[model samples]
Target: HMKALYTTIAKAHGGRNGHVETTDGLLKLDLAMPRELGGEGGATNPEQLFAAGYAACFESAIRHVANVQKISLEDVSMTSEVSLYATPEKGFKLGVALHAHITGLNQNEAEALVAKAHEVCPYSNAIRGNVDVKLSVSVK
Candidate 1:
């Protein structure tokens, strides 16, 4: 077990029908279930929020790993798509797909670095063995 270093709190109002805001006000959003789920689809949902958080976390991991390796990436970006799925017994589940665009390195080198980062990234570690995460790297 790891020692706890920080704890953050966020609050949501009206469940999937109203709004959610972080304690620090860094993030505040109007929320609505997707139209596919029978609610109006004008605002964001939990899946999008999770995808955004994971994308940012993974990209930071990539950058940190590159810095430690003495490599400078000319451009690096990631798209995280999180999908909501139904489980046989559970109410719902999530799946993630990450498409990383990395430049200034060969395919093998970039992918190897990504693999190493996945080992260190907090989000990757958190979701490991819990969900299906598809990771792919593309050079641009």
Candidate 2:
């Protein structure tokens, strides 16, 4: 049987300083971390850094939900965002927001799938409110 829906997930080695052949522009990922966080000050902090993680963990979660639910959605896309919020008491805090759009899906079905993804996604569950994660999904 031709299982077009069955696709394997993969991660490739993305080097820093932008490589010409491999990971460059793949994620547009640029990172720098400080010595305070056990990282070279030449790079940004973890809040901005992915720690070598993919930028779209929530998207993967949505895929997981859809695959498990057999929700045949097309043109699924999401904007993964992260920002830093600083306050006197908190110093610097991290926040995450995602805007997901899916075509060929009804609003109710999309919500259910996203909810299931939120529940199961390791990134979502791990971040918790400690790191704010917001989702904005649109079904058209």
Candidate 3:
């Protein structure tokens, strides 16, 4: 078993209808149900935060892979699209699509590197059997 090197906690007031506060008080975000789901819809939501964290972590994973492979990269960026859907079995589910844009590399090379990153990323591995995650790599 992997020992815990670090742990973080956040407290939420009213589930999706309220705000969340981090233990360190650095993050205090007001939550709102998206307009699509029928609430005030002006505040930050869980899906948005997940997408942000996943994208950022995935990027770091890519950097790690690149370093190990001794590959030089330029202008790397990722865009994550997370969708929330209603399911009969489960009330709601999430889907993710990650679009990775890279410069200074050929299409094949970029794709190969992104594939390695996917394998190295903890987020990708954790959701492998559970979530539907689509990954695309493009060179610019």
- Candidate 3 lands at a TM-score of 0.94
lDDT tens readout by residue for model 1, 8-126: 77899888888888898988899988999888899999898899999999999999999999886888998999999998997899999988899999999899988988888899999
Q: Which one is best on TM-score?
A: 3
**Stretches > 4 Å off in candidate 3:** none
Over 4 Å off in model 2, which ranges? 1-45, 51-55
After superposition on all CA atoms, what RMSD does each candidate show versus the true structure? 1.5, 8.5, 1.2
| Alpha-carbon lDDT of model 2 | 0.66
TM-score of each: 0.93, 0.61, 0.94
Q: Over the stretch 1-140, how does candidate 2's per-residue lDDT look in tens digits?
A: 87686444333333433212223344433454446556555644445444224246767888878887888978677676777567799787767777778787898888878778888877777777677677778998
Instruction: Evaluate model 1: give its TM-score.
Output: 0.93
Q: Can you write out model 3's per-residue Cα lDDT over 47-97, one digit (the tens) per residue?
A: 999999899988988788888988888778988999999899879889999
Model 1, 49: alpha-carbon shift in Å?
0.4
Each model's number of backbone clashes?
0, 4, 0
Ranking by lDDT: 1, 3, 2
Cα lDDT, model 2, residue 13: 34
Error of 1 at 58 (Å): 0.5
Report lDDT (Cα) of residue 95, candidate 2.
Answer: 74
Cα-lDDT of candidate 3: 0.90
